[PDB]
């Protein structure tokens, strides 16, 4: 997790065999890539969606 | 806030406004349906407040503002075990009835301890609030906004002859000019991380505003994030 987050793009944790696992907060969803955090809920925490 | 720039409309969809004995008299955050997160030095008494979510002109209709009374008030168990420190300066709202999340009344997010304090040590957040806009001056009308940066603990250490806690940060600016005020108290600091803030911080105390040599000092949320997520869950 030591450069750049793991490359997650919320929550790291250092696993075993040098490998990472990432995680999300309440309302994301860990993506298929297994790095970025989709939206799991109509109005997910932190997000500006007026635009 | 100081030195600030208007927001625009749903750009801080988590932030709310006290009214009370005193209208507009300080901020929050929206921690879910439920429960709003503030300073505990706004919320003293246990007279009654409302919160008003979804809103922008705090003197005008937007018909996005969502109004509702507090049921319960949960300060947080150690502050004023000493007096007048503002230390713990965080507090807990119970609504009456869920607000309707959407894009103008949404949540903040709140990573753990840990992430929480990752997040602020990247080192620049935001402030926001219908605080004063100057120092001993009116309050806003449209909900202000603005960048601070982190200072480190030595600098903040020596520019007041208060105490500054573990439990507590500084943000501003060397130069003074820009700074969160009175009225602004319990609205959030957030860190914006890949286009999803998260709450690293509340607005707690400061000696006057935006003074040169002076910052603002914050309640470091990553200390209180269990305290948060325990008396908040839904069910
Ligand atoms: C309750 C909340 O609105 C204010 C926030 C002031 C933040 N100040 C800065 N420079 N960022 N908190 C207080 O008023 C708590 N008391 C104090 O800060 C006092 N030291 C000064 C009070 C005053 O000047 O009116
Ligand atoms: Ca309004």
Known sequence: ?51 | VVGGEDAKPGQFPWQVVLNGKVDAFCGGSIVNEKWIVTAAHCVETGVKITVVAGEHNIEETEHTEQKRNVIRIIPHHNYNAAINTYNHDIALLELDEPLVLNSYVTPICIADKEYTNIFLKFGSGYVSGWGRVFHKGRSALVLQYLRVPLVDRATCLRSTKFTIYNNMFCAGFHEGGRDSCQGDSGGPHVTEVEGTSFLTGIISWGEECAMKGKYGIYTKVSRYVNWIKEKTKLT
Request: glycine share 6%.
């Open chain 1, 1 to 51: 997790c030591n450069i750049k987050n793991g490359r997650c793009e919320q929550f790291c944790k250092n696993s075993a065999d040098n490998k990472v696992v990432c995680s999300c907060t309440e309302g994301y969803r860990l993506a298929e890539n297994q790095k970025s955090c989709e939206p799991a809920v109509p109005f997910p925490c932190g997000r500006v969606s007026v635009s």
